[PDB]
UniProtKB/Swiss-Prot annotation, chain A:
This is Large ribosomal subunit protein mL51. It comes from Homo sapiens (Human). One of its GO terms (cellular component) is mitochondrial inner membrane. The chain holds residues 32 to 128 of 128 of the full protein. GO terms for molecular function: structural constituent of ribosome. Belongs to the mitochondrion-specific ribosomal protein mL51 family. It is found in: Mitochondrion.
From Swiss-Prot, chain B:
Residues 45-78 form the KOW domain. It is found in: Mitochondrion. This is Large ribosomal subunit protein uL24m. One of its GO terms (molecular function) is RNA binding. PANTHER family: MITOCHONDRIAL RIBOSOMAL PROTEIN L24. It comes from Homo sapiens (Human). Its main location: mitochondrion.
UniProtKB/Swiss-Prot annotation, chain F:
PANTHER family: LARGE RIBOSOMAL SUBUNIT PROTEIN UL23M, RIBOSOMAL PROTEIN L23-RELATED. Residues 130-143 have a biased composition (Basic and acidic residues). It is found in: Mitochondrion. Belongs to the universal ribosomal protein uL23 family. Coiled coil: none annotated. GO terms for molecular function: RNA binding; structural constituent of ribosome. InterPro entries: Nucleotide-bd_a/b_plait_sf (IPR012677), Ribosomal_uL23-like (IPR013025), Ribosomal_uL23/eL15/eS24_sf (IPR012678). Signal peptide: none annotated. The keyword Ribonucleoprotein applies. GO terms for biological process: mitochondrial translation; translation. This is Large ribosomal subunit protein uL23m. Keywords: Mitochondrion, Ribonucleoprotein, Ribosomal protein. It comes from Homo sapiens (Human). Component of the mitochondrial large ribosomal subunit (mt-LSU). Mature mammalian 55S mitochondrial ribosomes consist of a small (28S) and a large (39S) subunit. The 28S small subunit contains a 12S ribosomal RNA (12S mt-rRNA) and 30 different proteins. The 39S large subunit contains a 16S rRNA (16S mt-rRNA), a copy of mitochondrial valine transfer RNA (mt-tRNA(Val)), which plays an integral structural role, and 52 different proteins.
From Swiss-Prot, chain G:
It is found in: Mitochondrion. Found in a variety of normal tissues including spleen, testes, thymus, liver, kidney, brain, adrenal, lung and retinal tissue. Potentially represents an important therapeutic reagent for HLA-A24 patients. This antigen is recognized by tumor-infiltrating lymphocyte (TIL) 1290 in the context of HLA-A24. Component of the mitochondrial large ribosomal subunit (mt-LSU). Mature mammalian 55S mitochondrial ribosomes consist of a small (28S) and a large (39S) subunit. The 28S small subunit contains a 12S ribosomal RNA (12S mt-rRNA) and 30 different proteins. The 39S large subunit contains a 16S rRNA (16S mt-rRNA), a copy of mitochondrial valine transfer RNA (mt-tRNA(Val)), which plays an integral structural role, and 52 different proteins. Interacts with OXA1L. It comes from Homo sapiens. This is Large ribosomal subunit protein bL28m. Residues 1-54 form a transit peptide. One of its GO terms (cellular component) is cytosol. Pfam families: Ribosomal_L28. GO terms for molecular function: RNA binding; structural constituent of ribosome.
Length: 97, 205, 51, 124, 118, 152, 244
RNA sequence: GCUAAACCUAGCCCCAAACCCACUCCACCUUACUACCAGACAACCUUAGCCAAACCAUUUACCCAAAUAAAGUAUAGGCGAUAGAAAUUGAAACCUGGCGCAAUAGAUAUAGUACCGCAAGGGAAAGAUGAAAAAUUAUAACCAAGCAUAAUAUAGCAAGGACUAACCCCUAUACCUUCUGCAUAAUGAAUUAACUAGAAAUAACUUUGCAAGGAGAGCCAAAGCUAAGACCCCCGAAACCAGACGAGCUACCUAAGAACAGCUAAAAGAGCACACCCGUCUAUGUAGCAAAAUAGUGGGAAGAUUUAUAGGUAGAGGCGACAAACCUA
RNA sequence: CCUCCGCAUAAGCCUGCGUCAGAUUAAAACACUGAACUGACAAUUAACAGCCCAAUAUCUACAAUCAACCAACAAGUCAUUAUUACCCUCACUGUCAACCCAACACAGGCAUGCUCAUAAGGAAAGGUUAAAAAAAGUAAAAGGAACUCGGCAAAUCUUACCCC
RNA sequence: UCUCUUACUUUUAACCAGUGAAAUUGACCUGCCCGUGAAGAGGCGGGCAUAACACAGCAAGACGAGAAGACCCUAUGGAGCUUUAAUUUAUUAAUGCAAACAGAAACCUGCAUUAAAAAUUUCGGUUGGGGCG
């Protein structure tokens, strides 16, 4: 019980597809391009996460002040509660002071 | 009418049959079989058209197509790729064995040129008159769609009018003369009903 | 506690496929001999008499 | 314990509820004093049934018929087939004016007509 | 039933006959009056704040004298604004799921049928 | 007519006339014993006995003297695999009595003699099963289950 | 997911499509304007920078308006921009004391005024601020015309402006029909506020009233296709005869 | 060898892009989904409290329309927990993605359905053959607990040392948690399977780069500076506030009704005693027939009576022949 | 053999022991005709009941109780005319059941009209044995509260007194 | 009722047949005596007893089972209630002034003072069974 009786379907990974053969390209755009571009500008994803890093509370705070006016009512309410809980957890709970 | 589940699986038995209900009850849910998307215009296999089996138990044999299923891209050929099953079995009788055909995918069959009974690939083109036809890639020749009996089974060449069947001379005669009167107004003129009372105006809101 | 068995199967006829279908059953062999052959009585004696 | 997801009909409720709820049939009168119902003859839909004697058409059509393409009727198609020949004939004669639009068949107002077009005051 | 298909043919004939007669009346109504609908109506907000097509009815008294008609409210109060956003976002989630699911089907379908890309 | 807007009537107004009616009635066999002149129909809910009286006289030219209608409830007890109640639509049953003393009896629409085919019918699939079944015989107990195909 | 536009921009998006986009251009500009009203319940700083006594540094100062609640009864009078102040106070003016809710209401008077342009007397509810502002404007008619929308803070006051502007634009002879000389004298005193009747007809109207007003201008029974096709047929016939 | 066990899809999540739906016919604000009569009926009004300050009473973060930086700085504050700018500086921007989930997961969703509640509201469970079921002669073996195959033989935390040999001999006071100390007759656990609990880089340390400079604006520097690695859990109250939903049970009231044999008496909130209402005593029952009943015995039974129907009073409250009663067990 | 039940209406419920068929087969047992399960078909027919009222003014002191006496207070449950308008006529809906509210085919709750013992409606015992203990009932020598917190239960159908 | 119980019937009961729960359960191959121990031992020490085994009774034990039971104590945990606990008059009402008026007054509004009715919050530890700390 809890373990399959048959082998999993075989998985074949294309080590030389378009994405892997061209992964990491232009990571030296700033060094080799007279510093016109920055490698952080090559990041694709959320507008509040391009070229930025932080903990869970900092991500929620940054997301609320950048796309908070565009979020859905349910999602915005959940984000506000998450900030309230994380504020209480980090600033009032822990092993070290 | 038609009651098909979102992930209903089509099979050899037609939908709505007694066997189909037992095979596919409304409550069962099976993995939807992956079907390669083929446009209706791109489909080139029709009933009554001889095709050659490329892969199977008996490859390279040509047989007429009796049924095609567009939902799963299925081709059925009579007398080819058929297994054996007992029909009409009862408790006391073992049953009678008959050959039952198996479906073939569109990539497992290949249309054959009428001039040369060899597998070939065809491409859709147009004639001078503009009618769309299929032209073989090699040794380009016109391959018309073979004639097949209709689904209902009525033969127009062997059709006899019944007691409640309108004659062609009366079903094609034009009696409508365009005017600026409604059916209600026209009928009262023909019937002769006279209504001198007027219709008082009402409020609509 | 309202769960029950999935007993919903009913017996149908396998004699004929669904009607009003373009596809028809293709048969390779006949059911019986068209004209039954009755060997003459005494053929066993003629087996010895090869000539 | 009431089934709130069931169709509410006249069969449910007390006597007052059952008598006031109907099934969709249009009324053909009104109630007078003493609960005496008065039926109006003009409120009863009178069926205009034509004479079917010697009628060529039949419920079915023989299969030996051409497969003519469908040509849905439009206002522009109706105007050209009916009104245009009348206007063209008078235009050539040289006696044409907007004042005589009612003469060609145009109806400036639907009032005073037994069968108004908008809003219509007749059944199907 | 001996010939079940006979009923379907008549029903198709009845609907076709009804379409022809209705179409002729519609074409004539556009010529004489120009109205696209045989029944009067208008676009009005209901009490729930959604735009609906209200089909007019026949009355003997004008609307400002109708006791029962004036109880019916055809305007949305400010507290319905928040619910309209909630219902709009609910459809947006439904719409987003349909769009994203279709792309997932195509991406998986190219794995087993690479000839589709080629 | 049903699913239509009836034009409102005022005192001295025009007669209400219907040229095309969408009402469809079906004659049914009564489940219990009924008088000879009594005829039973199934009519839509929007249809009344006054409309039905003019319906038969107007279309079928059947003189009717008394019309009585009742609404029959459809059982909602049936539940599908989702435990959702399945509703049988309600129908209105109308009882019509003939006017001039005529007696009506529901005919037998499926005579047994007509069902039996006097002409020969030979289905291809049926012939295959019948001939093989008769030719094949039950295993002889004296054979003890030994196959009869072998002639040795 | 995320909305294409922020929620606070949806109000101005509804003015891009529908009947709102068909409103007159001048009227649409007046709604989008967010001009700051005249301070009433607070004293403005008067300068942009001040010297903080604590550290002796030039710091920036800003005027933060105090929210004002206007009861629906204030739209039938001329309160002069005053209204109810819904706020909190500290007991005995001590920060350490408990905080209590306080509401300040203006002193209302039902004074009577006479308008020279409309030639009519009105019995309206006004405050002492309105009485002072009328005297500073030297007449009720001047007060109505000079005061902007965000300072009047009264729907009835905006309707008076619309009524007065139309008479200044139409040169309506209804103002003293029996006194032609007196009529011209009044219109020569308010000639500086002349506005074209096209633009003076939409002054003071709310967004809801403007939508209905524009709908009426666009409301008309559709032209029958018979009239349209008659023009098309005759036009084609006229061109047909030219070729002949 | 039974029960079972496995079996991958349905679909979903997070982004990006782009601003979305809403007239076939008929019906639908009255008791919604009801063809068809004289109305007058109107929307707008600071959130609070939990919580933190180890109580609490002033106070205590909550997108407000440019990321970064100035800066956690100026200021605010039982000057205390904590709150916190601006001038000024200036940003790239290519939807068609995944070191996301794979039926106890991912949306609750096969569905806001079944079901539960008078209502607001709460809220599921599950599916699995194959190319072909128009092959069921079918989708072979092994796998949890539970059983069956196959009941048991002195003696004892069930085992260990052993032994020719299962036991017999010898040795051995279950586990976790909480306490100074538990074989403890202290807590928890029938068992099987799945699910279920340590998130943060200020300083310091370690290992690279460069070096009186370091860093891809700002910042730090008397060997520093940049980058990485590496430290901070889960479940549980009684409560509080805001907005809704409830008087079909019950408490009282309103509208218009109904019931009360017989006998004794007298024009009785009278007597005896049925229907009816009530529930004194005792017994049975105590997961019961019943989340308050049964049998017998009792109180009232023409009245401050009993009762059907519709309506009213709603929580900072109602209502009360005051029992801190009753307001959907 | 029981009948403290019954029948109908109101309210409620919504086809829920009618017919046929079923690989059928669990209603707290049974079951082939098995059936209060599934499928299909059939049904309850209006006179009863519900659904009413042209407008404007103007009218309505004297209970009920066999209403006649008498005797009351708590003071009560039932009425029109004038003028104008007006003459079409039987539609629509309810009609079944062994039924409802209590999670159940629950010893409970459940309004009115008749029957006051039935002319209607039912079945306490699956079979056996006749141990203990337990529940209910009946009988008892001699004594008659000696039992017990207490004449509680039971039998019987009593007297007198105190507290509140 | 009892001295002093007894007999009988019915239900239950037990057996045969059908249907078929619930609390409970660390694992048990589950003995007595004496002693010992977290202070009350089927399991530890020393003696004694001891083929296996079901059914029917019994209620001394398993500190038996059932609702973190009741009972005292703890918490800078709650709530109700009372008040000469603390903090307030926002609200309500009554006066005063200002304002506003007429020519005097009222309504309204602002600021005060009185009460009313409420609102928020807390109940320091130490020691002491027959006290008045
Ligand atoms: K029922
Ligand atoms: K015991
Ligand atoms: Mg009827
Ligand atoms: Mg009516
Ligand atoms: Mg009416
Ligand atoms: Mg605190
Ligand atoms: Mg505390
Ligand atoms: Mg799930
Ligand atoms: Mg096992
Ligand atoms: Mg030993
Ligand atoms: Mg509250
Ligand atoms: Mg009540
Ligand atoms: Mg009596
Ligand atoms: Mg009495
Ligand atoms: Mg009582
Ligand atoms: Mg007592
Ligand atoms: Mg009782
Ligand atoms: Mg008495
Ligand atoms: Mg009520
Ligand atoms: Mg009481
Ligand atoms: Mg008391
Ligand atoms: Mg007390
Ligand atoms: Mg009647
Ligand atoms: Mg028995
Ligand atoms: Mg005795
Ligand atoms: Mg004694
Ligand atoms: Mg004694
Ligand atoms: Mg004594
Ligand atoms: Mg007694
Ligand atoms: Mg048994
Ligand atoms: Mg259990
Ligand atoms: Mg033993
Ligand atoms: Mg001991
Ligand atoms: Mg021992
Ligand atoms: Mg025993
Ligand atoms: Mg016992
Ligand atoms: Mg402490
Ligand atoms: Mg507070």
């Amino acid at each position: 019980i809890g373990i399959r009786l048959t082998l999993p379907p075989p998985k074949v990974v294309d080590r030389w597809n378009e994405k892997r053969a061209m992964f990491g390209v232009y990571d030296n755009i700033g060094i080799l391009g007279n510093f016109e571009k920055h490698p952080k500008e090559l990041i694709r994803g959320p507008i509040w996460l391009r070229g930025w890093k932080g903990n869970e509370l900092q991500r929620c705070i940054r997301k609320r002040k950048m796309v908070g006016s565009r979020m859905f009512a349910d999602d915005l309410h959940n984000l506000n509660k998450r900030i309230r809980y994380l504020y209480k957890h980090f600033n009032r709970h822990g092993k070290f002071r | 009418k038609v009651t098909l589940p979102p992930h209903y699986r089509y099979g050899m038995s037609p939908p709505g049959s007694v066997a189909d209900k037992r095979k596919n009850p409304p409550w069962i849910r099976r993995r939807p079989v992956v079907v390669e998307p083929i446009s209706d215009e791109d489909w080139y296999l029709f009933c009554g058209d001889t095709v050659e089996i490329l892969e199977g138990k008996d490859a390279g044999k040509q047989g007429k197509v009796v049924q095609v299923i567009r939902q799963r891209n299925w081709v059925v050929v009579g007398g080819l790729n058929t297994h054996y099953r007992y029909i009409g079995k009862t408790m006391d009788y073992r049953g009678t064995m008959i050959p039952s055909e198996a479906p073939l995918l569109h990539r497992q069959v290949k249309l054959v040129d009428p001039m040369d009974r060899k597998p070939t690939e065809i491409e859709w083109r147009f004639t001078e008159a503009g009618e769309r036809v299929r032209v073989s890639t090699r040794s380009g020749r016109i391959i018309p769609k073979p004639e097949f009996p209709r689904a209902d089974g009525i033969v127009p060449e062997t059709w006899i009018d019944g007691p409640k069947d309108t004659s062609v001379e009366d079903a094609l005669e034009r009696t409508y003369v365009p005017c600026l009167k409604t059916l209600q107004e026209e009928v009262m003129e023909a019937m002769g009903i006279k209504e001198t009372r007027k219709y008082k105006k009402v409020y609509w809101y | 506690t309202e769960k029950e068995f999935m007993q919903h199967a009913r017996k149908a006829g396998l004699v004929i496929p669904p009607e009003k279908s373009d596809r028809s059953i293709h048969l390779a062999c006949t059911a019986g001999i068209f004209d039954a052959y009755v060997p003459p009585e005494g053929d066993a004696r003629i087996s010895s008499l090869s000539k | 314990g009431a089934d709130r997801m069931s169709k509410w009909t006249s069969k449910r409720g007390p006597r007052s509820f059952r008598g006031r709820k109907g099934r969709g049939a249009k009324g053909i009168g009104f109630l007078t004093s003493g609960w005496r119902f008065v039926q109006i003859k003009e409120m009863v839909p009178e069926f205009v049934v034509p004479d079917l004697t010697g009628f060529k058409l039949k419920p079915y059509v023989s299969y030996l018929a051409p497969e003519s393409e469908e040509t849905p009727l439009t206002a522009a198609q109706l105007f050209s087939e009916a009104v245009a020949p009348a206007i063209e004939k008078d235009f050539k004669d040289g006696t044409f004016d907007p004042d005589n639009l009612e003469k060609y068949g145009f109806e400036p107002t639907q009032e005073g007509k037994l069968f108004q077009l908008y809003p219509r005051n007749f059944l199907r | 039933m001996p010939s079940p298909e006979r009923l379907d043919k008549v029903v198709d004939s009845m609907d076709a006959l009804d379409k022809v007669v209705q179409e002729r009346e519609d074409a004539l109504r556009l010529l004489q009056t120009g109205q696209e609908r045989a029944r009067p109506g208008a676009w009005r907000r209901d009490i729930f704040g959604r735009i609906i097509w209200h089909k007019f009815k026949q009355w003997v008294i004008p609307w400002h004298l109708n006791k029962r008609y004036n109880r019916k409210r055809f305007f949305a109060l400010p507290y319905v604004d928040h619910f309209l956003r909630l219902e709009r976002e609910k459809r947006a989630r439904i719409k987003a799921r349909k769009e994203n699911l279709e792309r997932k089907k195509a991406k998986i379908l190219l794995k087993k049928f690479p000839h589709l890309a080629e | 007519a049903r699913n239509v807007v009836y034009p409102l009537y005022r005192l001295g107004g025009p007669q209400l006339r219907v040229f095309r009616t969408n009402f469809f009635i079906q004659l049914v066999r009564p489940g219990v014993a009924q008088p000879e002149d009594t005829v039973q129909f199934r009519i839509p809910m929007e249809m009344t006995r006054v409309d039905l009286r003019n319906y038969l006289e107007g279309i079928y030219n059947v003189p009717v003297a008394a019309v009585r209608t009742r609404v029959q409830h459809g059982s909602n007890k049936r539940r599908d695999h989702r435990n959702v109640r399945i509703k049988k639509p309600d129908y209105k049953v109308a009882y019509v009595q003939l006017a001039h003393g005529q007696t009506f009896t529901f005919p037998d629409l499926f005579p047994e003699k007509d069902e039996s085919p006097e002409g020969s019918a030979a289905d291809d699939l049926y012939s295959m099963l019948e001939e093989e079944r008769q030719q094949r015989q039950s295993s002889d107990p004296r054979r003890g289950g030994v196959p009869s195909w072998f002639g040795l | 997911p995320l909305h294409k536009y922020p929620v606070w921009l949806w109000k101005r998006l509804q003015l891009r499509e529908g009947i709102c986009s068909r409103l007159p251009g001048h009227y649409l500009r007046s709604l989008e304007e967010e001009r700051t009203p005249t301070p009433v319940h607070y004293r403005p700083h008067g300068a942009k920078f001040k010297i903080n006594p604590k550290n002796g540094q030039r710091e920036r100062v800003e005027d933060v308006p105090i929210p004002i609640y206007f009861p629906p009864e204030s739209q039938r009078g001329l309160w002069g921009g005053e209204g109810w102040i819904l706020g909190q106070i500290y007991a005995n003016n001590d920060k350490l004391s408990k905080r209590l809710k306080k509401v300040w209401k203006p002193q209302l008077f039902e004074r009577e005024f006479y308008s020279e342009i409309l030639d009519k007397k009105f019995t309206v509810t006004v405050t002492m601020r309105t009485l002072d502002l009328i005297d500073e404007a030297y007449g009720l008619d001047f007060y109505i015309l000079k005061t902007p929308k965000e300072d009047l803070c009264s729907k009835f006051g905006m309707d008076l402006k619309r009524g007065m502007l139309l008479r200044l634009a139409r040169q309506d002879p209804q103002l003293h029909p029996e006194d032609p000389e007196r009529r011209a004298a009044i219109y020569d005193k308010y000639k500086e506020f002349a506005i074209p009747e096209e633009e003076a007809e939409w002054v003071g109207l709310t967004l809801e009233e403007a939508i209905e007003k524009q709908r009426l201008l666009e409301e008309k029974d559709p032209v029958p296709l018979f009239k349209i096709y008659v023009a098309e047929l005759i036009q084609q016939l006229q061109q047909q005869a030219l070729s002949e």
